[PDB]
Design a protein around this nucleic acid. Structure first.
Ligand code: ZN
Ligand code: ZN
Ligand code: ZN
Lengths: 736, 333, 205
RNA sequence: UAUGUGAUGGAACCUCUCCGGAUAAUUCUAUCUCUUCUG
């Protein structure tokens, strides 16, 4: 109840400031704080406007119940809770505060999330007693095998934890250790053995008689121990996903999802015990072990985005005979009471039958790369407005990468644009797009891994502003910041990743995937955000063409429209104003349906063309482009903009100039305009009445509407000195 | 005057104003002479004889009915103009839409291009935020229009004033409010590319013309535009239309048709715009600011912002001689 | 038609623009946020501000009218449509009715504590309870209609039909409906299921 | 906290579907301040 009251109070403060669009962001931010630890916590600050005066953060400096600083209110609340409740820590407090705020958001802030979620489930539990005598048999076990091993996660994994009544979280033990259930391992093993033996068994829950058949005849004699994370107990990380709208190219109304994801490198011990009447291991088990040793199969839930790849190492086994070596077996009770002394090594040589195909992909980026992490940007002390996504590795430091979900989205969008299938209904469709990636009532045939940047990337500070069109200059103090990875044509960024496809995929789907990959390599789709500002361009070599000499396709608009142009003549004996104002036009032409993005070419009303333009820029007068860093404390010296010692001009400046000239020509609207502003001016001392303000005073603590009038008099207490008349007569006689 | 922290307190001493009206008080002023403030908002201060120039994406809060709509929850239906999107918002994109053109980075053939002032730092003078209450004197004034900067050769004076001995009174002081920056010499070339997709032929023609103006005119870029820095010119080398065929004649004809449809044979605004893009290379042309409060004896020019508002400009007429490009205020003494 | 005349056709939930021709903003918002926009290019238009008579600050009557219209259309012209259209219409109606029922139940839950201090005030709270009962009856109707057309995959009766019938029976019993309860019981009897006890006897229903 | 001549529940993968995307030139000139005492 205390958590609910705190969540309600926090939801009130945001509503009062008029900041209800960040409640979900804070809900994830508190869990990020959970992960970030409290001992070394240092929340960010403002943008440091003026010369050196820090400003107020837009979330961390919200007045809550007279406590202006939320950064201290949260600490005080945590201290009070720790004092009140025993067995209390930062992690539990943050988790409780997080779910509570999530509930408040879903309650008070609608339309911020999607919900056709429940489909094809219904729980079922069947049982039935036998009707006939089963009989008797004469075949029994005569051997027992104990197999050791370790499972190492070479890719982040995800095992779902859900109760009937943080929507999804990674399951773990009560002590914090990550857990790999035996049910998942048994299911994966039986699926692999069914694939090997080419069966279609479903087990039909409870039947009249046991199913028999090899799948149910071999799993009836296999015992698997549950496993726990041997070296990892830390809380996991949070990953976000969105769904775009093909027509507008932006997110949908409620497309936002969250899922905890475990780290990479967690070691899970492995245990297998097979008891059967055979002197050698079954061929299917050896085949499955061969497949597992190469890490060619997925073990976790989200296999569509390349998650849950595990590798088996250090295999060893020992065979026990219960007919003549009963004493040796009973000495160790099957290896569970006491660890076994001597182990035997197993070969398990090779196998190339697994139904997946791995193809490596390398793509080089010739521009700065940026991806936005809004939740992480609020917990980093550097204060940057946007920062790039990073992961963690338990073997070795942050690793910059592009998530495989974005690559899957890019591939799907490219295929849909190529074949014009991005708008067709996909319920009972079975088209190319519904085959490669699947629909709701199907699955996929492709697994896409993450793309890890190779090398030693470096970050840079990039600044942006919005220049009002009425009065030139910044419309507000709000500068923008980012931390992209520096990339130039000479020093490119190399991305490496793996793509797995099914052996049962038809040739047409493979050709479509190859065409999409070729288009991606050519560079029809930028990587990451800010693609329209020159960030993350593939195959960008602007210096390949040996410059632009003179000009081609030249025409004069003024001559064809009979503009006088007022050539006129300038005078030397006058001083001209540095700037002027351009009067507005009369007609503004607006349209309701701009061209769509889901189709490569659909000439419903006019032809459409796509390509690129090569340009060149030269300076008639000296140019000044400041950098983001300065050398000094009082008089800040600046250098020219550079990307690791290479001078360049950002595309934002060119965009701005071209846009502004475009509104100048076409008489469009004012795209940047501070329409919410009221002027002040001054009252002249005298001016048909110059002044008519009556004198009145505020009344007592009654209704604020009432106000009583008053008459003005004169008052003392603003003087120079008090003395006799002689001093006053001596005040004069200075001179003159 | 110590300002009150917030709101109105039951016992604060201020001055009120009352008219007949409905026996109510309309404004509150702390002292007898103070900021009169302004009713209405800047959004609807545009002239009535001009088409709607407000952004296609609007804000409902022009009244405090933003609260009634927000609580009601119908916030995505009272935004956008009833007619749709303007050509600029359509081509370049808005928050809800996405732009169809992209601008890349501009690089140099060599690693180190030439720098002005022999690589030394330039100490620019003090730059301060523009004051909007100069072209809008009275409460009944209307918005003049967009602001543009003219081209001149005033950077030579700035460079010469810097790199000067501190003993000379004409030097520029290195105060905390100043800024020191580097510059690139003239005639230095940069190369870049522009990528576009799903563009009509008239849009492509207009964009090409905007990028490649007539040789007489030039663009403006960078810091210190008022001082003459950043006059640049962009050249277009080749158009890649892909497999589809494209010829320049159709682009020119389509741009002509679109401009004729939009402007409908009106040339005053276009003439004023083209006058502002003229590249003035004369070294004898001087552009400065009036330097408020002219002092000292003798002529000392007729400039000065307060003095300029007394004789020739006047509050009624300052919505003029500012919309007329290339007009001076005072003669050389 | 004496209706909204915004939907192109009941069996395909699309709107061919023209929604903004109306004056009620709630109707436009409901028709836009819960239906396919059709067309092939994005549509960017809005209404005019400074409209009086408020906005009525709620969506429940509009959603109830949409649900009733969808059920009436399914009852009248349900034979000619194909299976996918029936499934889509029924699912959308169920979702709208569920949202309305959840909103009404939450409102009643918050109002109960306040009316506890009103000295047992018999007022519009009774009408809210009646509205909740009506919504429950409509949800039971929709669930029964959806369950009547479930595809029988496999030798045995699919579980989906069993859970749908159980939910319909629960809704009908809570809504104090007799004809719908009898229909649900008749459907349950033909499925050979015998989850009902002596208390929930078919004879008494 | 069973009741005894009869327990394959190790007899079941929370699975499946979704580009943290969109828009923005790190830019820049007009004052500020209200009570004066018959002049
Ligand atoms: Zn079987
Ligand atoms: Zn399809
Ligand atoms: Zn616009």
């Amino acid at each position: 109840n205390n958590m609910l009251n705190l969540a309600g109070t926090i939801s009130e403060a945001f509503e009062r400031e008029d900041k209800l669009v960040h409640l979900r962001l804070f809900a994830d931010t508190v869990r990020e704080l959970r992960r970030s630890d409290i001992e070394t916590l240092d929340l960010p600050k403002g943008h440091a406007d003026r010369l050196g005066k820090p400003s107020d953060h837009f979330i961390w400096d919200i007045e809550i119940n007279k406590k202006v600083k939320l950064r201290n209110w949260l600490f005080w609340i945590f201290n009070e809770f720790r004092d009140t409740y025993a067995y209390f820590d930062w992690r539990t407090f943050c988790e409780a505060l997080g779910q509570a705020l999530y509930l408040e958001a879903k309650k008070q802030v609608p339309n911020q999330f999607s919900s056709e979620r429940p489909v094809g489930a219904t729980p079922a539990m069947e049982v039935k007693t036998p009707e006939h005598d089963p009989g008797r048999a004469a075949q029994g076990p005569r051997y027992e095998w104990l197999i050791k091993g370790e499972l190492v996660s070479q890719t982040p994994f995800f095992f779902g934890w859900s109760t009937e009544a943080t929507n999804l979280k990674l399951l773990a033990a009560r002590d914090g250790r990550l857990r790999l259930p035996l049910s998942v391992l048994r299911g994966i093993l039986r699926r692999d053995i069914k694939v090997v033996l080419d069966n279609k068994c479903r087990a039909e829950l409870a039947m009249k008689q046991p199913c028999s058949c090899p799948v149910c005849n071999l799993m009836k004699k296999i015992t698997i121990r549950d496993s726990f994370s041997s070296n990892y107990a830390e809380p996991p990380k949070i990953r976000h996903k969105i769904r775009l709208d093909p027509k507008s190219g932006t997110v949908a109304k409620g497309a936002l999802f969250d899922s905890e994801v475990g780290p990479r490198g967690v070691v899970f011990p492995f245990e297998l015990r097979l008891r059967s009447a055979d002197d050698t291991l079954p061929q299917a088990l050896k085949t499955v072990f061969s497949w597992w040793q190469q890490g060619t199969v997925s073990f976790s839930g989200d296999a569509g985005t390349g998650k849950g790849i595990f590798c088996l190492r250090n295999l060893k086994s020992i065979r026990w005979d219960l007919k003549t070596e009963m004493d040796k077996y009973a000495a160790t009770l099957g290896g569970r009471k006491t660890p076994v002394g001597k182990w035997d090594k197993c070969h398990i040589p090779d196998d190339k039958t697994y139904p997946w195909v791995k193809e490596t992909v390398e793509i080089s980026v010739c521009s700065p790369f940026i991806t936005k992490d809004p939740v992480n940007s609020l917990i980093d002390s550097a204060g940057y407005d946007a920062i790039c996504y990073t992961t963690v590795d338990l073997e070795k430091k942050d690793i910059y990468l592009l998530k495989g979900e974005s690559f899957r989205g890019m591939l799907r969008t490219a295929v849909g644009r190529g074949e014009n299938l991005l708008l067709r209904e996909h319920e009972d469709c079975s088209c190319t797009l519904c085959r490669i990636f699947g629909n709701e009532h199907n699955a996929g045939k492709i697994r896409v891994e993450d793309f890890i940047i190779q090398g030693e990337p470096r970050t840079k500070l990039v600044d942006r502003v919005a220049i009002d069109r009425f009065t030139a200059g910044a419309k507000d103090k709000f500068k923008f910041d980012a931390a992209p990875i520096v990339g130039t044509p000479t020093n490119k960024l190399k991305f490496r990743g793996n793509i797995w496809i099914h052996r049962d995929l038809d040739g047409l789907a493979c050709e479509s995937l190859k065409l999409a990959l070729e288009d991606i390599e050519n560079g029809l789709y930028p990587f990451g955000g800010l693609g329209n500002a020159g960030f993350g361009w593939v195959n960008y070599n602007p210096l390949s063409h040996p410059a632009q000499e003179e000009n081609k396709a030249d025409f004069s608009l003024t001559k064809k429209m009979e503009l006088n142009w007022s050539m006129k003549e300038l005078s030397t004996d006058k001083i001209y104003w540095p700037h002027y104002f351009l009067p507005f036009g009369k007609k503004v032409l607006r349209e309701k349906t701009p061209p769509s993005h889901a189709c490569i070419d659909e000439n419903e009303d006019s032809e459409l063309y796509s390509g690129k333009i090569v340009c060149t820029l030269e300076t008639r007068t000296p140019l000044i482009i400041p950098d983001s860093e300065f050398q000094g404390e009082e008089h800040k010296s600046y250098d020219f903009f550079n990307l690791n010692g290479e001078l360049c001009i950002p595309g934002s400046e060119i965009r701005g100039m071209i846009s502004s000239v475009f509104e100048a020509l076409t008489n469009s609207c004012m795209r940047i305009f501070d329409e919410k502003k009221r002027l002040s001016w001054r009252m002249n001392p005298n001016k048909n009445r110059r002044e008519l303000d009556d004198f009145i005073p505020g009344r007592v603590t009654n209704d604020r509407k009432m106000e009583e009038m008053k008459e003005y008099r004169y008052p003392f207490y603003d003087q120079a000195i008090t003395a006799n008349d002689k001093q006053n007569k001596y005040f004069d006689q200075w001179e003159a | 005057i110590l300002p009150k922290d917030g709101e109105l307190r039951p016992g604060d001493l201020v001055y009120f104003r009352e008219d007949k009206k409905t026996n109510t008080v309309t404004d509150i002023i702390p002292v007898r002479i103070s900021r009169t403030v302004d009713d209405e908002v800047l959004a609807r201060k545009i002239p009535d004889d001009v088409g709607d120039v407000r952004p296609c994406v609007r804000e409902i809060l022009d009244k405090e009915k933003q609260k009634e709509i927000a609580d009601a929850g119908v916030k995505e239906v009272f935004q956008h103009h009833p007619d749709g999107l303007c050509p600029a918002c359509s081509l370049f994109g808005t928050t809800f839409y996405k732009g169809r053109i992209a601008f890349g980075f501009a690089f140099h053939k060599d690693k180190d291009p030439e720098l002005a002032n022999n690589g030394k730092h330039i100490t620019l003078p003090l730059l301060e935020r523009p004051r909007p209450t100069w072209s809008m004197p009275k409460k009944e004034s209307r918005v003049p229009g967009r602001k543009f900067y003219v081209h001149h050769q005033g950077w030579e004076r700035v460079i010469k004033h810097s790199n000067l001995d501190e003993s000379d009174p004409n030097a520029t002081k290195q105060t905390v409010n100043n800024r020191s920056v580097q510059a690139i010499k003239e005639e230095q070339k940069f190369q870049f590319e522009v990528r576009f997709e799903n563009l009509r032929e008239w849009e492509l023609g207009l964009l090409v013309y905007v990028l490649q103006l007539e040789p007489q005119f030039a663009h403006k870029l960078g810091m210190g535009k008022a001082l003459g820095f950043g006059s640049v010119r962009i050249r277009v080398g080749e158009i890649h239309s892909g497999p589809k065929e494209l010829d320049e004649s159709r682009l020119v004809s389509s741009a002509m048709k679109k401009m004729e449809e939009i402007w409908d044979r009106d040339k005053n605004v276009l003439e004023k715009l083209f006058r502002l893009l003229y590249f003035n290379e004369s070294k004898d042309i001087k552009v400065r600011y009036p330097k408020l409060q002219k002092e000292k004896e003798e002529e000392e020019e007729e400039s000065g912002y307060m003095e300029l508002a007394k004789e020739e400009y006047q509050p009624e007429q300052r919505r003029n001689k500012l919309t007329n490009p290339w007009e001076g205020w005072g003669n050389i003494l | 038609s004496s209706a909204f005349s915004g939907l192109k056709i009941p069996e395909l939930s699309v709107d061919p623009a023209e929604v903004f021709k109306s004056d009620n903003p709630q109707l436009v918002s409901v028709l836009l946020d819960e239906f396919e926009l059709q067309e092939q290019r994005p549509f960017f238009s809005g209404l005019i501000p400074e409209k009086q008579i408020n906005i009525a600050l709620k969506k429940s009557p509009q959603l109830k009218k949409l649900a009733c219209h969808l059920l009436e259309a399914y009852e009248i012209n349900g034979r000619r449509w194909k299976h996918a259209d029936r499934r889509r219409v029924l699912e959308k109606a169920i979702r709208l009715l569920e949202k309305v029922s959840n909103e009404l139940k939450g409102d009643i839950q918050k109002l109960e504590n306040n009316v506890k201090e009103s000295g047992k005030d018999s007022e519009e709270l009774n009408k809210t309870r009646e509205k909740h009962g009506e919504i429950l009856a409509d949800m039971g109707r929709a669930y029964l209609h959806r369950a009547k057309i479930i595809r029988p995959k496999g030798f045995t009766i699919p579980a989906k039909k069993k859970e749908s019938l159980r939910k319909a029976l629960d809704f009908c019993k809570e809504a104090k409906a007799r004809h719908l309860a009898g229909l649900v019981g008749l459907e349950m009897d033909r499925c050979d299921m015998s989850d009902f006890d002596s208390e929930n006897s078919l004879e008494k229903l």
